[PDB]
Each structure stands twice: as C-alpha cells, then as structure tokens.
C-alpha cells in the first residue's frame, strides 16, 4: 500500500477534522436535568411518612384505646369523629410539573 495501515471512522464528522463527535456531546445537559427530576420525586416519596397512625388525645379512654389497637370494637367520645381523626399518612401526590418536565 505504501501508506499508514490505520483507518479512521468518525461517527458524526467535524468540518475539516479527524475526530468526530459522539451522541454524548449533545445530551450533556439533558441527562443532568433528567437526573435532578428523578431524584426529587424519590426524595418526596422516600422522606414522607407512610403507614403511621395519628390519634387525637382524649378521643378514646384508656380501656377503649387498647381494644382499638387490638382490633376489637370500641366506643369513642362523640365530640370528636374518628372519620376526620385517625390520620393514616400516605404518599403525597406527585406534582404534574415533574412529569411534564
């Protein structure tokens, strides 16, 4: 052949240059932005309380409170409705902006 035995193959050729550009050149910012959104969604769910029960004080007497905790029928003071009480924390709803972004 009489010349160098090496062959150059660029992916995206550069004007009057040897080395081409890979796809990672254009997606540097997009990957970083996408990573921030995903971590934010996990932190919102992960750090949030889940499965914990909150009971207002004075709604149940000493004996009735134990029976409720043991899974039996109980009686409550009518001044406080357990429907709005007995908070059962769950995962907060994900904002629509995070999905849109």
């Amino acid at each position: 052949d009489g010349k160098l035995p090496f062959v150059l193959i660029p992916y995206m050729p550069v004007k009057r240059d040897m080395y081409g550009e890979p796809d990672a050149e254009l997606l540097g910012d997009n990957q970083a932005v996408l990573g921030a959104v995903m971590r934010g969604m996990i932190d919102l769910l992960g750090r949030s309380a889940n499965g914990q029960r909150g009971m207002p004080k004075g709604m149940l007497d000493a004996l009735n409170s134990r029976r409720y905790r043991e899974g039996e029928d109980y009686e409550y003071n009518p001044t406080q409705n357990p429907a709005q009480m007995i908070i059962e924390h769950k995962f907060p709803e994900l904002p629509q902006s995070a999905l849109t972004m």
């Binding site: 890979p22 990672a24 997606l27 970083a32 932190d43």
Partner: protein
C-alpha cells in the same frame, strides 16, 4: 468526558448526600443501546462479509 456520560462514573455522578436519593437515569446509555443493534445487524445478516 464523553465516556463519563455513557456511564455514571465521572463528573456526571450525583453528589452523595445522606438521607437523599443518589440515583441517576442513563439517558446517554439508552440512546447508545438502540444504536448498537441497528448498525451491527446489517454486517452480520449474511454468511459472506465481503463482496
């Protein structure tokens, strides 16, 4: 730097913070995966490689 974006090893690595998530989606890697099979397949579609 380009290799540091294909895999999360270099500057693209998220900071390590206690009590917070450290995950990082591989956007660059996903694009490359759909390109490997697309380009390798035509060369391996026949027993003879050179005509």
């Amino acid at each position: 730097e380009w290799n540091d974006l294909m895999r999360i090893e270099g500057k693209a690595k998220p900071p390590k913070v206690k009590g917070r998530s450290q995950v990082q989606p591989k956007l660059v890697r996903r694009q490359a995966e759909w390109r490997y099979s697309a380009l390798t397949e035509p060369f391996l579609g026949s027993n003879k490689l050179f005509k």
